[PDB]
Amino acid sequence: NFRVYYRDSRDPVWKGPAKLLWKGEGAVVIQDNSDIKVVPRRKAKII
Amino acid sequence: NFRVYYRDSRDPVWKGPAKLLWKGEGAVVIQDNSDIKVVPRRKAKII
Amino acid sequence: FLDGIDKAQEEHEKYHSNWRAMASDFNLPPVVAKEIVASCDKCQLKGEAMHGQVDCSPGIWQLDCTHLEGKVILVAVHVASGYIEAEVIPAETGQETAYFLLKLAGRWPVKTVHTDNGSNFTSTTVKAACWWAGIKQKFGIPYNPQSKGVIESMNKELKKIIGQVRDQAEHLKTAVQMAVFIHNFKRKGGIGGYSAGERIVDIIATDIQTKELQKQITKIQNFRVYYRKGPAKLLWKGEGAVVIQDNSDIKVVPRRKAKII
Amino acid sequence: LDGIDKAQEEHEKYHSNWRAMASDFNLPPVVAKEIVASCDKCQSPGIWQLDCTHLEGKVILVAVHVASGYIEAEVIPAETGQETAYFLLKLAGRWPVKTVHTDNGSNFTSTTVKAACWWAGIKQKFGVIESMNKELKKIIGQVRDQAEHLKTAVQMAVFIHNFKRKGGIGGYSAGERIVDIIATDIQTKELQKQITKIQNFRVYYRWKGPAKLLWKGEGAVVIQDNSDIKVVPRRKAKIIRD
Amino acid sequence: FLDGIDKAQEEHEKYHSNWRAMASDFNLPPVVAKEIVASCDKCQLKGEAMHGQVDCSPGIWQLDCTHLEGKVILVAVHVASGYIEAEVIPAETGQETAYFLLKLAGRWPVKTVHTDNGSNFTSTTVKAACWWAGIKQKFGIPYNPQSKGVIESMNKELKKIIGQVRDQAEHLKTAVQMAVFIHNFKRKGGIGGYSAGERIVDIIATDIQTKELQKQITKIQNFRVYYRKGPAKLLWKGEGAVVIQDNSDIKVVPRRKAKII
Amino acid sequence: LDGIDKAQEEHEKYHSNWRAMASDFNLPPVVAKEIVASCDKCQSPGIWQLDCTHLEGKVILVAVHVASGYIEAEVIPAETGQETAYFLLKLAGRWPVKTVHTDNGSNFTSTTVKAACWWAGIKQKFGVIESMNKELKKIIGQVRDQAEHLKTAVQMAVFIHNFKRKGGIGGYSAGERIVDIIATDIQTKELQKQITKIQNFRVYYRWKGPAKLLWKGEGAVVIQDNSDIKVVPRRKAKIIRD
Amino acid sequence: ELQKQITKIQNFRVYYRDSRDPVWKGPAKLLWKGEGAVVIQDNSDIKVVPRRKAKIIRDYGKQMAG
Amino acid sequence: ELQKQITKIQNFRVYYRDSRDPVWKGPAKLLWKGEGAVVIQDNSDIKVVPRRKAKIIRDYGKQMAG
DNA sequence: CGGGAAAATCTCTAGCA
DNA sequence: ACTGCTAGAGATTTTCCCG
DNA sequence: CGGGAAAATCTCTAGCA
DNA sequence: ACTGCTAGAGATTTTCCCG
Ligand SMILES: C[C@@H]1CCO[C@H]2Cn3cc(C(=O)NCc4ccc(F)cc4F)c(=O)c(O)c3C(=O)N12
Ligand SMILES: C[C@@H]1CCO[C@H]2Cn3cc(C(=O)NCc4ccc(F)cc4F)c(=O)c(O)c3C(=O)N12
Ligand SMILES: [Mg+2]
Ligand SMILES: [Mg+2]
Ligand SMILES: [Mg+2]
Ligand SMILES: [Mg+2]
Ligand SMILES: [Zn+2]
Ligand SMILES: [Zn+2]
């Protein structure tokens, strides 16, 4: 599996780790504490 | 001679034409109605 | 360096050293230093250094609102051509957005709309209007104007032309319509040296024409190809290459090891 | 190139147009247009028709692209020159509008409508609009119950007419037809541009007299001398501007 | 096209058409279309698409103030190395800026300072302090933070490290000093895989050493060179090339057509 | 490479250090350091000295880099551990501070100063500082009239001492000297890194027994066998990790 | 009959992009068109392109210049 | 005497930029240094560089790895 | 000389507000 | 007469290690 | 085949707020 | 499961025009 770290939409603080649920060209889908979220790959890091 | 057109520091409206007084790498020195001004070449156009 | 990793760990627990500092100092391999930095949550602070690519299928429009002199200008762009349609509306409300979209879809073929999450767009009215006229609503990632870069740049350009012409009109709505005319027919460039109006006409006519031609080809050209595997429909062949579609998976294979029946 | 004589024979047998030659025997469009223009015996997309309609005590402004029957309509607050002018300015910024045909009225014969027409480069001229207003009203009645305010029913009828009704030769919508007509018109204007570009030159070949330049390619130069199109190699010809 | 230019002029007086639209439509040469656009004041709306380059001589520092949790952090960077010095001050005043600069110039060799035009920097106090310690004050173009890009990026980086360490300290000033330590000694990269502390030491020692070596060479190596022209001091020679300095104008000439005396 | 024997003879004649060999006969520093380390008969930059001084009813914190005499000073509100710790944390983030030598006092022997020393990796130890405080006070008196508040005169005296006074061997400032000393120290730590890297390998050449790897180049491998440095071609040698 | 269709499809110009390159790649040459993928010819190199990334035109213009 | 000085100047590495390129150009080789211009050797190509654009170091770690 | 692996170099982004 | 930069994250291209 | 001139292509920026 | 873009301004590199 992968850990995801991500800037949320407006908040400047980086959150994570979250699970990777889906990876596209341009965006990812992550799960952080039962909270599905869609983040730009610009605002996210997958390990 | 050259005409200069330039965004001033903060105002979004483009002014000009002004005379070229000096041209450097990165900035120009212009005269617009007896008002010497130093503009970035990013914010200016010389014709 | 088995001993240094422990020292590099306790140190990073304090200074959070990049991988190079720890590799230099505690004499660790680059992979081990990178592994130490990689497991610290307090150092995962930067995203990927790329950009996505927005969709450009001939049926997708990007809509946004924008503000100029106290008024709300509602703007659409056809993504593939750059063709804009704008209008000074009196309020960023769902009623004025659903009416604008109903007019757009009655003029041009609109399949998908891409907007941000402003309320006028996430309305039940805009939704029932899109439903009535078979339009699919895409919402970008919240607070990601990059997902709508086309319409955002067109906001920039529309407002630049509006500034150029504003003195030729009394009211803002007239300036706005003149700027739409000017962007659509008086500015040439892009892929075919086109104006946005000509370019959209080309994109729509080409779409119609090629869909027709292909319906005809596939009605006539009926073949099954075996390559390397099972049967596969033949798409196009030529110049020592035979593009086929097997199990909804298009692939190009060389002419050898490929028999047509 | 080699089939120019065949194209010339074709035109003398069926009087077909330049597009047919260009699609069949593979010729540049200027050369086909020249072949079709050499026989004297062988000798719209921008006109809109405007009119107002009244419905349930409100006025609908209707513009019909005559060549296609494509319709653009909206409800307007009042039959004024301001509203007719704003309508016209919207229409011309969205479709190439060259000429508007209106009835003798006030809104249409107004200095503000005239000023909008002048700013947009539109010429004015004072039974299509009537029949297509009838069809508009029919659709507006067919869908009235699906919308509270009248303007929504007017735009729903515009949608249905432009895209859900189908007829004619091969069953196309008004949107399909206007797109094809405007596309043909862009082709036409482009070929006119190419002619207007090349007709300002003269060619000298093998020297012989002056000869009109038609096409200019990689290893050939198609010209015209004494009403007879002829191909010469580029190295053996000289092109000047006059 | 002499006739079209008049039509292209009246049209541009209305729509302001880019050069491509007018060239396409009125059949004008590209140079003539560009000349029409070029003489309309209402179309000169975009600057040059480049960036300048900030000075990086070993004696120039960039100073800025920045804000974090209600406090004012005064920051300096040595441009050539990336070496930072910061301090939570109680007020963006000239007194607290002149005292900070007096301390910097007593620790490191400071020749020029580059700041924006905020009041703390354009003070008479900062000016008399810079005068006392022979420092030259450069002020960038007003509202051009690009001229101070180095210190601005260092603001970004300082605040990132401060966020990483903030929980290890009670007060902000302690977090700030720890972040200065961390940036100066616990982050390696750049030109010589250095930390900013090592890099500044190298830049200063190299400057001292090479100035000395050259004083010695020029005291020993005394020659006049004639090339192509008059006499010219010889700077360095080798590998079929002889760099000379004539009339305060350095030039490299090939070994041929150049005689040393 | 060829002059390794000459360097060996040189060390047996004048007992010069590895830097001399590396600068003279052009040898990698690890090989020169090995040559200088093979003779038993031939066998600071991070120490600071802290102390407080009192002047006109205010306390000055003074830190002197002993190897150079470079001084860092400021006025502090009070002789507390908080202020000594904040001073120390500033000093270590700006100069590489390994060891601080203080007198037996309160501020210096405090859990907060101890915590700052521990966070920054500084060792503590409880007539240089006295003389250089005297010189500091002399300059502070020389410039007092040029500044109203005492802290400005303290920083002006710091400036003058670190950069306007000159003495010693060739007349350098304390800033010049500390920069050279820290630069030598970075060189030293780098050579120590290179040794600590290479000494984890063994070499087999021509096979013979194990041999310590010294330098590894493009077309040569300098090793050491039986206390005798020897050069072998790379193709004829094999390097492993142990 | 059919070859006319193939060559006419062939006259249509395809601008397109790849996964990470923001620059649009010069007019290729349309070989086949489907509901979601386009098959083109870019400098004697056959590529398949997602529909969502390909703008297809005729270049009325290049065409009337031949 | 003098050649030692020349080669020692020669050991110093020069990073530098040109007029419109934001990228720093890899270590050249210091040939001469003046109050405002630096003369370097960048891949057997002698250039003169404004001082304000050149960062000059030794690379203490390259030097001690020889 | 040649793959595989490692390292160096290149490309590109956010934030500095 | 003055001027975007920095440091990390993936991608690409050199460099190296031994058969 | 070869310079010179023109055109096409490349590189890069602000604003969208 | 989604995604920066656009149009102009200088710079650079192809393409062309005729000796
Ligand atoms: C309340 C709705 C919904 C939720 O969010 C807000 C706020 N917002 C902010 C911007 C904006 O920041 N544009 C600057 C920009 C920056 C980068 C880039 F690539 C493109 C760009 F346009 C918009 O454009 C926009 O339409 C909105 C909006 O509509 N809303
Ligand atoms: C009152 C003083 C003097 C006059 O102007 C103001 C306002 N200002 C604004 C920014 C700012 O907008 N930073 C964002 C940014 C954008 C682009 C870029 F390349 C670098 C960047 F930092 C500053 O950083 C800053 O120090 C000030 C300041 O000090 N002042
Ligand atoms: Mg919006
Ligand atoms: Mg927006
Ligand atoms: Mg500031
Ligand atoms: Mg700032
Ligand atoms: Zn960490
Ligand atoms: Zn204009």
Q: Look-up: residue for tokens 């061997």?
A: F169
Which residue, chain included where needed, has tokens 């407006």?
A10
- The DSSP symbol for D168 reads T
| Residue pair C113/C63 in contact by the 8 Å Cβ criterion | yes
Is ligand 1 within 6 A of the CB of residue C15?
A: no
How far is Cα C172 from Cα C167, in angstroms, rounded to an integer? 10
Long-range contacts made by residues F161-169, C-beta under 8 angstroms, separation at least 24? Answer: F161/F71, F161/F135, F161/F136, F162/E106, F162/E107, F162/F70, F162/F71, F163/E106, F163/E109
Under 8 Å between Cβ of G55 and C191: yes
Select from D151, F93, H40, F234 the least CA-distant residue to C100: D151
Query: F193 in contact with C at a CB cutoff of 8 Å?
Result: yes
Pairing between β-strand C112-115 and β-strand C83-89 as defined by DSSP bridges = unpaired
Sign of torsion, CA F136 F137 F138 F144?
A: positive
Please state, in angstroms and rounded to a whole number, the distance separating the CA atoms of residues C181 and D94: 7
Contacts 24+ apart (CB under 8 A), F218-225: F220/F1, F222/F1, F222/F4, F222/F28, F222/F31, F224/F34
Helix ranges (DSSP H) in chain D: 4-14, 18-24, 29-37, 81-92, 111-119, 128-143, 150-159, 174-198
Residue F204's H or E segment, with its range, is strand F201-205
User: What number of H helices and E strands is found in chain A?
Assistant: 0, 5
C-beta separation of E101 from E129 below 8 A: yes
D47 touches chain C (CB under 8 A): no
- Given a contact cutoff of 8 angstroms between Cβ atoms, the answer to whether D48 and D101 are in contact is yes
CB atoms closer than 10 angstroms to residue G22: 10
The residue written with tokens 């086909």 in the block is: D32
Single-letter code of the amino acid located at A14: W
Domain segments of chain B as ranges:
1-47
Residue C93 has, within 13 A of its CA and on its CB side, a CA count of 6
The total of other beta-carbon atoms located within 10 Å of residue E159's CB is 18
Q: Is the Cβ–Cβ distance between G37 and C235 less than 8 Å?
A: no
Token pair recorded at residue C73: 């200008």
Query: What's the CA angle centered on E179, arms E174 and E185, to 5 degrees?
Result: 125
What is the number of structural domains in chain H? 1
Q: Does a cis peptide bond (omega within 30 degrees of 0) precede residue E109? A: no
Q: Residue B18 in contact with residue B37, Cβ under 8 Å? A: yes
CB atoms within 10 A of CB D111: 10
Distance CA E167, CA F173 (A): 40
CA atoms within 13 A on the CB side of E137: 21
Query: Which residues are paired to C61 by β-bridges?
Result: C78, C113
Spatial CB neighbours of F145, under 8 Å, sequence gap ≥ 6: none
Handedness of CA F140, F141, F145, F148 (dihedral sign): positive
Q: Does E96 touch chain F (CB under 8 A)?
A: no
CB atoms within 10 A of CB D154: 29
Query: Helix-strand-coil percent breakdown of chain G, rounded to 5?
Result: 20, 35, 45
Residue C153: CB within 6 Å of ligand 1? no
3-state secondary structure labels for all residues of C188-201: CECCCCECHHHHHH
Check if C140 has its Cβ closer than 6 Å to any atom of ligand 1.
no
* CA gap C37, G23 in Å, rounded: 34
Ligand approaching nearest to the C-alpha of C21:
7
Minimum CA distance residue for ligand 2 atom 10:
E145
Do the Cβ atoms of F74 and F99 come closer than 8 Å? Answer: no
- Closest protein residue to L18 (Cα–C1'): D238
Rounded Cα–Cα distance for residues C81 and C205 (Å): 12
Q: Which two tokens stand for residue F127?
A: 């007539």
Do C116 and C140 touch, CB atoms closer than 8 A? Answer: yes
Which of E211, H66, D230, C130 shows the shortest CA–CA distance to F1?
H66
Contacts of G34 by beta carbon, 8 Å cutoff, 6+ apart: C214, C235, C245, C250, G51
Residue owning tokens 């880099």 = F65
F93 and F71 in contact (C-beta within 8 Å)? no
Q: Is E10 annotated as a binding residue?
A: no
CA dihedral D128→D130→D132→D133, nearest 10 degrees, is 150
Residue F51, amino acid: D
For residue F98, list chain E residues with Cβ-Cβ distance below 8 A: none
* Alpha-carbon gap, residue F61 to F70, rounded angstroms: 14
**Model resolution, angstroms:** 2.8
Nearest to F179 among E102, E184, E204 (CB): E204
Find the C89 Cα to ligand 3 centroid distance in Å: 14
Residues F110/F85, Cβ–Cβ less than 8 Å: yes
Residue H50 lies in a domain: yes
Strand I: positions under 7 A of a protein C-beta atom: 6-7, 9-17
Query: Residue C175 and residue C10: Cα distance in Å, rounded?
Result: 65
C-alpha E123: how far from chain center: 23
Other beta carbons less than 10 A from residue E259's beta carbon? 11
Ligand nearest to the CA of E143: 2
Question: D183, G61: Cβ pair inside 8 Å?
Answer: no
What does the DSSP assignment read for F45-63? TTEEEEEEEEETTEEEEEE
For D51, how many CA atoms within 13 A lie in the half-sphere containing its CB? Answer: 17
What does the DSSP 8-state code read for residue C168? G
Q: From the CA atom positions of chain D, what is the Rg in Å?
A: 25
CB under 8 Å to F238, separation ≥6 — which residues? F203, F204, F205, F207
Parent domain of H43:
11-57
Q: Kindly report the bases of strand J lying within 7 A of a protein C-beta atom.
A: 1-11, 18
Using the structure block, give the residue that is written with the tokens 């190897």: F67
Please work out whether the CB of residue E153 comes within 6 Å of at least one atom of ligand 2: no
Instruction: For residue D102, give the nearest of D138, D64, D134 by alpha carbon.
Output: D64
Q: Where are the alpha helices (DSSP H) in chain C?
A: 2-15, 19-26, 30-38, 94-107, 124-132, 149-165, 172-185, 196-220
Tell if the CB–CB gap between E143 and B25 is shorter than 8 Å.
no
Assess whether the previous peptide bond of B17 is cis (omega < 30° from 0): yes
* E112 Rama class: left (phi>0) / alpha (psi -120 to 50) / beta: beta
CB C57 within 8 A of CB C207: no
State residue C255 phi and psi, 5-degree precision: -65, -35
What residue type is F27 in one-letter code?
A: L
